[PDB]
Structure formats: structure tokens, C-alpha cells
Structure 1
Amino acid sequence: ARVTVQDAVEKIGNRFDLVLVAARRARQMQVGGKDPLVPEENDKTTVIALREIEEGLINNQILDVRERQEQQEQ
């Protein structure tokens, strides 16, 4: 659980953009067709995406490249 979202904020620094990035990641994990890249502690998708951003393995650019890779695969 993310009591504070400071780490994600410095990872991508806007305090306004990480809301959008984490919303996109949480949508991907919640609608379907995606699995978390961080161990799951029975958290909701929200703080899971926040933890993924904090660990530095999710941002806007790599999300775009994964979307492009999925489009190229199909």
C-alpha cells in the first residue's frame, strides 16, 4: 500500500501527469489483457500501478512503446 506517492512523483515529476499514467496502467490491468510487473500483495490496481511507477519500470514512453509493439504483433 502506498501511504505517500512521493516516490512516483519524483520518478515522473508533475504531480498531475502520474495520475494519468497510473490511471492508464490501472485500466490496462483491470479491464484485462495485462498482468502486474510487480509482486501483488492483494492490493487494488491503483496502488499497484503507483508502485510500478515508483519502482521506475512504468512511464508514458514505455507504455507507448508497448502499445506499438502490441499493434505490430497483430
Structure 2
Amino acid sequence: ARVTVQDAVEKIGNRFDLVLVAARRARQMQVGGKDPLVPEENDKTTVIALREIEEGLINNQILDVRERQEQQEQEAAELQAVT
């Protein structure tokens, strides 16, 4: 369902960290069991990752802050479990 990624390239800006962020997101949904932010029209993980960057729901900054969010959350959960 994806042929061109020119808009994704211009959204990321350099066509190189786009590949890295798309691969990271694809691994997150494929291995980490994450839920895609866009409906999947019977598509692979890479295509879904590329498709949910087009409208800006995934980029390096928000992905980093979101990963930090659940890592703080799991650290707090472990601390509460210890106590």
C-alpha cells in the first residue's frame, strides 16, 4: 500500500534518520507488541511504520520522549513493587 516515501523523507528531512526511526518503530510493534497509531490495511510492520510517520505521529523526538515515559513508568513500578 506504499509506493513512494517522498513526503516521509521531507518530514524527517534527510532520508537517513527516516530509515532508522522507521526500523525502530517496526521493531517496537513487531517485537515489543506495540499497537500501531494508524489502522492497518493488511500491511507489514515496516509499511505501517512508514505510514504512521506521514501525518507526524512518529518521529525521533516524540519516540524518544515516549520511550523515556514508559521507562520511567516501569522504574516506578519496580520501585513500588520493591516497597
Range class of TM-score, shorter chain: over 0.9
Q: State the match for 2:55 in structure 1.
A: 55
Q: TM-score, normalised to structure 1's length?
A: 0.95
What do the CA deviations read for 1:29-74 (whole angstroms, capped 9, x no partner)? 1002311000110100011000111111100000101111001111
CA distance in 2, matches of 1:36, 1:24: 13
Secondary structure in structure 1 of the residue aligned to 2:10: helix
- 1:11 matched to 2:33? The reply is no
Taking CA–CA contacts closer than 8 Å with sequence separation of 6 or more, which of the two structures ends up with the larger relative contact order?
1
Q: TM-score, normalised to structure 2's length?
A: 0.85
- Structure number with greater Rg is 2
Aligned pair count reads 74
RMSD of equivalent CA atoms:
0.8
Secondary structure in structure 1 of the residue aligned to 2:71: helix
CA distance in 1, matches of 2:34, 2:72: 17
Secondary structure in structure 2 of the residue aligned to 1:58: coil
Q: State the match for 2:28 in structure 1.
A: 28
Unaligned runs of 5+ in 2: 75-83
